[PDB]
Amino acid sequence: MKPALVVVDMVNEFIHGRLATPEAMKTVGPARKVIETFRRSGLPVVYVNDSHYPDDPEIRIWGRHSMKGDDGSEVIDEIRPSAGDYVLEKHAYSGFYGTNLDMILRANGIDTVVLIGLDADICVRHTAADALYRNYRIIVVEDAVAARIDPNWKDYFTRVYGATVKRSDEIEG
């Protein structure tokens, strides 16, 4: 296995600001733990963050959120990115759509994505879908992901994306 960690939407507006929830806050400790081990082990860490324009397709659905330029779209300080970490702006749910995520994964010979962040129903899941199409294996760190609407999310990942589910305190590296 050669994995990269993809950290989805761990940004101020969903953790600290206007759309903050406790489910979201609960992810921060575990996320820092997962991020830290990947770094200490030299493997790629990639942040993929909403950085929306007013006319992005999904703005009609949600209204303005995690806008480009506004501090809402910035990664929370708790897991501030370091030198060597990749930071990507995205305009749709999936971390792959309109981004160079796939490039970075291919350039570092990656065959497995480890997914954490916000959230199990929308962006994490959508990123997972695209990973599958592109023949990556998928791992999700349950305690580092927050649900929104679906309580059967874990089941969906496993049954539909063949994902294996782990906890932050586990590490196959």
50 makes contact, choosing from its own copies, Zn ion, none, with CB < 5 to 8 Å by partner type, with Zn ion
Site size toward its own copies, by CB under 8 A: 38
Phi and psi angles of residue 158, each rounded to the nearest 5 degrees, phi first: -70, -45
The DSSP code for 42 is: T
Q: Kindly state the DSSP code that residue 58 receives in the 8-state scheme.
A: T
CB 45 within 8 A of CB 4: yes
CB 101 within 8 A of CB 88: yes
DSSP state of 63: -
- Nearest distance in Å: CB 66, Zn ion: 5
State which of positions 92-111 bind its own copies (CB under 8 A).
92-94, 97-100, 102-104, 106-108
Exactly one of 8, 27, 38, 50 binds Zn ion (CB under 5 A); which one? 50
Distance CA 67, CA 54 (A): 8
Report the binding-site residues.
50, 52, 58, 65
- Contacts with its own copies, residue ranges (CB under 8 A): 53, 55-58, 60-61, 91-94, 97-100, 102-104, 106-108, 121-122, 126, 129, 132-135, 149-150, 152, 155-156, 159-162
